[PDB]
């Protein structure tokens, strides 16, 4: 009749032309650019197929033991499988650790941990945004509470030294005695080094606070064994299932379960599960949990372990190649997948550079460097190797890359001379758009990057 | 070269055999059962293909105007398209309404509004859980603050008349005068009737509170024009993009923008507060594939085919009501203005607890709910039945008459085990007797073998074999 209603069978490319091209376009913008954004990566066809399944269609509100609905014989099979793969892939005795796989992304998971362990107005210490922390580790101004984490809990930042780039731990341990936090966060969004979880545990225990690691950026490296495991000192560990773990967007919270002390058990499990549900979320996204389960399988495999070993080495290559060209790397080096490039040695800033490199189809982002005084004119560049390593690039290809980046910095500087010394940014950006002189080089530099990029592959479903 | 590690091109059926079967099993459990859970539905292949795309791979932190990263020409094209489809599908002048499209789901969308407009410890009022409200509308008891809504904010509930099953608006107006809510919630999870948004606006205004509608359950019906629009009285309206809108799991927040009232003249400020609460306040990077699906689902929602499916959904409900009323069941408000009904199983001598399980075992899905009059949330007397999911598989009035009949058989059966169980018997007992007795297991198998035969006669929306 009008029961043409089986438009439900109709495929996207025919149902929504507008959305189809957008996908076809983006997936192409990916194939030709160089992704150096540390938090980016490319999920496998496998993980990606799970997201489109009919598991979207099931409401499984509660947990595998206790659910609020019924046709859940399979969603329980699934969620359990995922919890088991998670604890396995990080090699955790389930008689010591548990895992919640329901958080929707990194952020919710973090939050849910605060709700659970810290309470409304309890204190949190996180590394400052400019010194390398995340928005969810608290973030204020003398005027406003930006991040929900500073709106509902009382937060305080601990900073890195402004000459080493290193977290000043003697400071943290001194202020924590004065601030009295209920939880210390150990995790970063832009830090080249391994965190001393051992010392942090000391500081936490001396205050009767929980040590929480947010290993979102290094989760992949930790599965492989490349960087040291946080699990040895922390009571809780949250993580995205997608930055270097290379899954789809989701989050997990790992918590300790078992014994704790003199003459007493952990209670972490029930508090954290409750906070995620019914505390904060609604029905779990089962297709998401599927992809996470898939990605955890692939992560245990030795092919992942090699990709993760490649990732770090690709970073040492890129560092050296740039060091050799006169660039300063912030802590002098890196223990993992990223580097903080200080562009003050080349006479420019990360604000300007970021834009010129962007126009050349090279992606990265600006970041403040330890010493900076003005988050308005940031001096750094955050470069990471995960996404490009997933497309195959081995060291020699990254030397190729270091060179393109260099050209781009040279380019940004030409525009910084030809712009004037008291030049606003709206200007610099204007001149990069209108001046034909410049457009020529930019266009040339780009035509050169995309072709280099098209050589390696782009993971994903049929073409996209 | 271990660099043959391109296990990244390798398909699921080959890469994860364990998860493949789990998907193949569930998608099958779906084809043979009768889904009567009101919040469930089946998304189209179209909406479902968008979820698997490369859009997953992009980080687009900020908003279309100001993002924090760069390769976003397309994500902006997309997010805008979605915002436009949304305002369009509900027929809203974009000079009067804006839409945030990044909530990861209904729950977080509500939380963001409360975070933006009510602030920490600000007062909120919503319908009580057992009276048909939703968890996120606040939920607390004598000992614990259970929902996060009632942890960070201070909530107090309003209830339905227990002799009528209708919201008692008189009490809500009285109580609001003493409680001073900063925001009143107008939305339900299990309510057969239209909410008088008009009167709720008059109570909100009298108190200088915001009227927020959470139309999650009825969003589909509202796009078709079946039930009346909340948009005519509320300052903000949140909704899932998946209950009766039939999309993927995500959420949206609609807010007023323009001039709110004059002395000069003061504008709404709703937009910037809301947007900021969503980001960078609460969430991280948007899920672009999810947004793609929502955009797809909204285009399908404007089409007259959706409008006909939505008109069918309501009628299928009237069919299911009557068929059941005719068998002696008491429908809670006596009827329904939408997609669901709250069945009172006290007239058949049993409860929602036991029934739910028997019907479950017979491949018939629904869930228990307290009825207005109930005193014991462990002994709920009701059944929430909804028509959306089965209407998406084609069932018409007449098919629902046979459904009504299967449900009936199942209640008769639950009663057989309740009698053959003893009166002072426990749910652990009832559930175990339903499992060990072959006497019972026979009927159950027979009734099940019969439901599946019936369900298989209908299509099941979804992408290929998965
Ligand atoms: C289900 C529902 C929600 C919550 O959505 P989730 O996607 O489960 O987080 C919010 N409001 C109402 C009215 C609902 O029925
Ligand atoms: C990116 C990131 C997150 C947040 O993940 P979203 O999905 O973007 O919410 C959390 N923690 C750290 C340390 C991160 O880098």
UniProtKB/Swiss-Prot annotation, chain B:
Cell compartments where the protein resides: Cytoplasm
Reported modifications of this chain: Deamidation of asparagine produces alternatively aspartate or isoaspartate, which in turn can be converted to aspartate through carboxylmethylation/demethylation.
Catalytic reaction(s) noted: (6R)-5,10-methylene-5,6,7,8-tetrahydrofolate + glycine + H2O = (6S)-5,6,7,8-tetrahydrofolate + L-serine
Cofactor(s) needed by this chain: pyridoxal 5'-phosphate
Gene Ontology cellular-component terms listed: cytosol; mitochondrion; nucleoplasm
Keywords of the record: Acetylation, Cytoplasm, Isopeptide bond, One-carbon metabolism, Pyridoxal phosphate, Transferase
GO molecular-function terms, A-Z: glycine hydroxymethyltransferase activity; mRNA 5'-UTR binding; mRNA regulatory element binding translation repressor activity; protein homodimerization activity; pyridoxal phosphate binding; serine binding
Main subcellular location of this protein, as a coarse class: cytoplasm
Gene3D superfamilies xref list: Aspartate Aminotransferase, domain 1, Type I PLP-dependent aspartate aminotransferase-like (Major domain)
Pfam families to which the protein is assigned, alphabetical: SHMT (PF00464)
Function: Interconversion of serine and glycine.
Similarity-based family: Belongs to the SHMT family.
Protein name: Serine hydroxymethyltransferase, cytosolic
Organism, scientific name: Oryctolagus cuniculus (Rabbit)
């Amino acid at each position: 009749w009008s029961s043409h209603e089986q438009m439900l069978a109709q495929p996207l490319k025919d149902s929504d032309a507008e959305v189809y091209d957008i996908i076809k376009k983006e997936s192409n913008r990916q194939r030709v650019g160089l992704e150096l954004i540390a938090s980016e990566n490319f999920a496998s066809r496998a993980v990606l197929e799970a997201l489109g399944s009919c598991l979207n269609n099931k409401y499984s509100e509660g947990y595998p033991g206790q659910r609020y609905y019924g046709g859940t014989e399979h969603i329980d099979e699934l969620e359990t499988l995922c919890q088991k793969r998670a604890l396995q892939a990080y090699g955790l005795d389930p008689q010591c650790w548990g895992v919640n796989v329901q958080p929707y992304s990194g952020s919710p998971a973090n939050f849910a941990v605060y709700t659970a362990l810290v309470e409304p107005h309890g204190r949190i210490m996180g590394l400052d945004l400019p010194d390398g922390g995340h928005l969810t580790h608290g973030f204020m101004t003398d005027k406003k509470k930006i991040s929900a984490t500073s709106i509902f809990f009382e937060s305080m930042a601990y900073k890195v030294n402004p000459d080493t780039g290193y977290i000043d731990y003697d400071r943290l341990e001194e202020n924590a005695r004065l601030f009295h936090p209920k939880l210390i966060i150990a995790g970063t969004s832009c830090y080249s080094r391994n965190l001393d979880y051992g010392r942090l545990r000391k500081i936490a225990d001396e205050n009767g606070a929980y040590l929480m690691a947010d290993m979102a950026h290094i989760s992949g490296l930790v599965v492989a064994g490349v960087v040291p495991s946080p699990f040895e000192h922390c009571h809780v560990v949250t993580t995205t299932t997608h930055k270097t773990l290379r899954g789809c967007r989701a989050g997990m919270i790992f918590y300790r379960r078992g014994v704790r002390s003199v003459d007493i058990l952990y209670n972490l499990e029930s508090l954290i599960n409750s906070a995620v549900f019914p505390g904060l979320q609604g029905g779990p996204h089962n297709h998401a949990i599927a992809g996470v389960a898939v990605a955890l399988k692939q992560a245990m495999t030795p092919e992942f372990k090699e990709y993760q070993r490649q990732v770090v080495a690709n970073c040492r290559a890129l560092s050296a190649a740039l060091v050799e060209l006169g660039y300063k790397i912030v802590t002098g080096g890196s223990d993992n997948h990223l580097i903080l490039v200080d562009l003050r040695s080349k006479g420019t800033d990360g604000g300007r550079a970021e834009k010129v490199l962007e126009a050349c189809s090279i992606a990265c982002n600006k970041n403040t460097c330890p010493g900076d005084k003005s988050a308005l004119r940031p001096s750094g560049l955050r470069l990471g190797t995960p996404a490009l390593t997933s497309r195959g690039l081995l060291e020699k290809d990254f030397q190729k890359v270091a060179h393109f980046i260099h050209r781009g910095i040279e380019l940004t500087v030409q525009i910084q001379d030809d712009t004037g010394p008291r030049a606003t940014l709206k200007e610099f950006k204007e001149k990069l758009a209108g001046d034909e002189k410049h457009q020529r080089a930019v266009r040339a530099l780009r035509q050169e990057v995309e072709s280099f990029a098209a050589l390696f592959p782009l993971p994903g479903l049929p073409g996209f």
